[PDB]
Design an enzyme around this catalytic site. Structure first.
Site, PDB file in Angstrom:
ATOM      1  N   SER A   9       0.838  -1.191   0.000  1.00 53.31           N
ATOM      2  CA  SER A   9       0.000   0.000   0.000  1.00 53.31           C
ATOM      3  C   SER A   9       0.875   1.244   0.000  1.00 53.31           C
ATOM      4  CB  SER A   9      -0.939   0.029   1.214  1.00 53.31           C
ATOM      5  OG  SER A   9      -0.209   0.201   2.417  1.00 53.31           O
ATOM      6  N   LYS A  10       0.317   2.338  -0.526  1.00 50.27           N
ATOM      7  CA  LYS A  10       1.052   3.596  -0.608  1.00 50.27           C
ATOM      8  C   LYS A  10       1.486   4.104   0.761  1.00 50.27           C
ATOM      9  CE  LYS A  10       0.142   7.458  -3.664  1.00 50.27           C
ATOM     10  NZ  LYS A  10      -0.472   8.804  -3.840  1.00 50.27           N
ATOM     11  N   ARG A  11       0.848   3.642   1.838  1.00 50.32           N
ATOM     12  CA  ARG A  11       1.189   4.124   3.173  1.00 50.32           C
ATOM     13  C   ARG A  11       2.518   3.542   3.641  1.00 50.32           C
ATOM     14  N   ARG A  17       4.094  13.496   3.737  1.00 57.79           N
ATOM     15  CA  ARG A  17       3.697  12.370   4.577  1.00 57.79           C
ATOM     16  C   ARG A  17       4.658  12.189   5.746  1.00 57.79           C
ATOM     17  NH1 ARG A  17       0.268   8.430   3.246  1.00 57.79           N
ATOM     18  NH2 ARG A  17       0.602   8.689   0.995  1.00 57.79           N
TER      19      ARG A  17
END
Ligand code: ZN
Ligand code: ZN
Lengths: 488, 482
Positions: free
Chosen positions: A253-255, A463
């Site tokens: 996932s992008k996280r 982020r």
């Protein structure tokens, strides 16, 4: 003696993804292993999410990785068009045949109708499915409603009992109950198809013989197999590849780990190393594309979910960097960032902030660092308490993640929209962008810097700043999503 | 007649800002009067000569005649001008204005001792001044080492007519009996410039104030020969903001330091002009509005902060293209970068790690953190000592290459009570600002001599520096080192 033909069929709905490159590599090697062709087909049937910019990003990212195709929208080919938006007439023809032969039907159920049926079904503990309403419509009524121009879709008929045998090339027979399928829509009300219809029609017309795709598509494989039956077409060989996994057994996932190919390019990874790493996750060491092809065999694919581990990718990338001449290294660094194009965009922004050239590097260093040094104290705001600061960063990050055209004015529009919505002045938010993007409280023009840095590094740095300050809880995330959706 | 000015730098070191200041005024005075500006070398190394040419040309200074461009009144290197100097010294001895001296260096060193013990300025005691014509003929036939000295009056006063200060009175009893010909048959810098200025038709001699005390000896030589004296002007000294004399301890003086630091040559040349006469202007403009009378009798101030502000205006008031070209020549070129490349290629896992690692190659100085200079087997006093001794020996290094840089550092260690491996922990922070980095020895060769010394000095002064009692004590160590 049939020539092998494989394809990759990405949707141009966002950034080019590592998963796409992974699947493309397997389809490429399988075709080259067997002396066949590898095709690229753009599935832009979703004309609300597809963009011409995202199309080109797919070409550039894959080509940068070293992946090349023999037929596609940018190179032509004898079995085109290779953009599904240029094949409208084709899909109508075959959708009409299915209806004519009784294997599909016209459905006039309005969105208000379908929503009502789904509610009554969830209340009866039943599995939500199209209730088959329009399947038993007289031909008289169908002719009338179509003559009045009433919106409609085309749905396929599916079995209600029994099991479908999906003959995977690696798993063997995979049994899937038909009652898990529904009467899938084939042609949407806007005259565009769904991938179920487009992929079957296009894989057939383009002569695709083998289809390696991620296992996320396996649950819906029976509907594709059934469509081949209705058309009387020979089904291609099917292999459903395990998913890419984060080292903690979770899904990629992008996280956790960025999934954008362009992120690793901008971070300074070599395409040979990233491509090499995707192959090592796949089958059974440092190798080139050519060497990976000669040693490729689908049987050497570990039946377990490949693991995307940034630690191993970085070590491998260092091996590639080290195991080559300094000239090769130099040319790769120039292409990456030490080129007149990149440096001349930075020039006008440092020229006015230096009293001698030795002050340029501390000022402009952040244009080459990937991330920046994180100093939590740099985000202490006068007007905004710590919680309000995290809200602003999260809302800005979300809007910039959705931004398709990475350009200063559009970047400024996203930030200004987040501020105006929160009853804040843009002057109140920019002080947070400087330390997030540059690592310093003051620097060159930060809006210009973000455009030069590109979307991937800008989001990555935002982020990290958000995570430096603690991030957002599940409760805050839910409350802040409500605000996100009310913002232009 | 056409005006003719000159500079006579000695090729015995790096070109200093003082040389460019004097050269500029000589160039401007000559251009103002439609004359020629001459560069003469009174040699010493052929490499050091090119350094002078390269540094002055980088600044924007030019000369109409010299060893590199040629000219119709050469040769322009002393070493190429034959036995012309011994000829003139011999005329002075024959006409009684000079004499032959046979004093040994051990004896000249003793007279200097007795004179300094009295707070006097050392002079030649005139021993051989009146030796018999027979005693001198004998010792010369035997081949005894000797020199030729000029005779100076002992009473009276010499009026030095300075173009700016006016008449300056100097007492002959301060002048000494200057050596004309050395024991090796070479002329002194003094005799050679007097001879060469006369033969090259130099009309105006613009020198630094440091040469004013010797003006009477120059005036007397021209008198002895019967030559027309040139117009004389002695420029006030360059001074730090605290009114002291310019010193590499305070502000660096090498032209090449300001080049490697990222200053524009048009800005440093403009600053040297804006110090003396009378704000931003080019060279062609400086020559336009030039006149010697606009020079202040008080010394100009070399203020680095004012220089930086001026350089910033030169950078701003130009196209981005011109700015980029200047940045390319300064450091963003394949020659400098490919020197760094092999030293980062083995230390990065991705290209975004290069800038944090290699940033020190471009930062001029480095961020200073005293805590980085805490050594296991060394105390805060010993660290300063090695830094000073390392700095001194590196300040005296002619050829700046890795194999010779390492020799200097090893010599200070071997001479000390420590091994080379004991000193490098201190070099890494001083040079790169980090406890560990690329090969620091290769880095120093790449960075150059100016920036390496500058950072070592900044590190030494960060930790406290050196007191007066420590300097004089540590120099005795420096002189005992190869
Ligand atoms: Zn219906
Ligand atoms: Zn004597």
């Amino acid at each position: 003696m049939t020539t092998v033909r494989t394809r990759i069929a990405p949707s141009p709905t966002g950034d080019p993804h590592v998963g796409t490159a992974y699947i493309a590599l397997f389809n490429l090697c399988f075709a080259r292993q067997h002396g066949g062709q590898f095709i690229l087909r753009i599935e832009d049937t979703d004309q609300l999410r597809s963009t011409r910019e995202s199309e080109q990003q797919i070409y550039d990212a894959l080509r940068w990785l070293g992946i090349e195709w023999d037929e596609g929208p940018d190179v032509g080919g004898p079995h085109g068009p290779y953009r599904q938006s240029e094949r409208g007439h084709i899909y109508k023809k075959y959708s009409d045949e299915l209806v004519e032969k009784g294997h599909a039907f016209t459905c006039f159920c309005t969105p208000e109708r379908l929503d009502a049926v789904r509610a009554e079904q969830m209340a009866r503990k039943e599995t939500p499915r199209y209730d088959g309403h329009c399947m038993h419509l007289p031909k008289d009524e169908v002719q009338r409603r179509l003559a009045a121009g009433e919106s409609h879709v085309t749905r396929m008929k599916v079995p209600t009992e029994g099991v479908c045998v999906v003959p995977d090339m690696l798993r063997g027979d995979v049994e899937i109950p038909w009652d898990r399928m529904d009467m899938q829509v084939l042609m949407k009300a806007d005259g565009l198809p769904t991938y179920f219809l487009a992929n079957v029609v296009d894989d057939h017309l383009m002569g695709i013989t083998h289809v390696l795709r991620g296992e996320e598509w396996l649950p819906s494989a029976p509907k594709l197999i059934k469509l081949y039956e209705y058309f009387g077409w020979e089904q291609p060989q099917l292999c459903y590849m395990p998913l890419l996994r984060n080292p903690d057994k979770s899904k990629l996932s992008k996280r956790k780990n960025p999934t954008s190919i362009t992120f690793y390019e901008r971070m300074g990874y070599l395409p040979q190393a990233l491509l090499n790493y995707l192959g090592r996750m796949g089958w059974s060491e440092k190798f080139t594309l050519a060497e990976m092809i000669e040693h490729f065999d689908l049987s050497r694919v570990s039946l377990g979910g490949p693991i995307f581990d940034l630690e191993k990718l970085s070590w491998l990338n260092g091996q590639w960097i080290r195991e080559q001449s300094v000239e090769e290294f130099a040319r790769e660094v120039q292409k990456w960032a030490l080129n007149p194009e990149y440096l001349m965009k930075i020039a006008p922004h440092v020229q006015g902030r230096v009293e001698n050239f030795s002050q340029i590097a501390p000022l402009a260093g952040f244009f080459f660092s990937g991330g920046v040094p994180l100093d939590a104290s740099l985000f202490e705001h006068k007007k905004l308490d710590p919680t309000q600061v995290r809200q602003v960063l999260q809302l800005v990050l979300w809007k910039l993640e959705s931004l398709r055209q990475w350009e200063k004015e559009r970047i400024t529009g996203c930030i200004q929209a987040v501020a105006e919505h929160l009853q804040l002045k843009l002057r109140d938010v920019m002080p947070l962008m400087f330390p997030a993007i540059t690592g310093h409280a003051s620097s060159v023009s930060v809006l210009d810097a973000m455009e030069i840095l590109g979307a991937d590094l800008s989001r990555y740095r935002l982020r990290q700043a958000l995570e430096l300050l603690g991030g957002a809880s599940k409760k805050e995330t839910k409350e802040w999503e409500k605000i996100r959706d009310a913002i232009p």
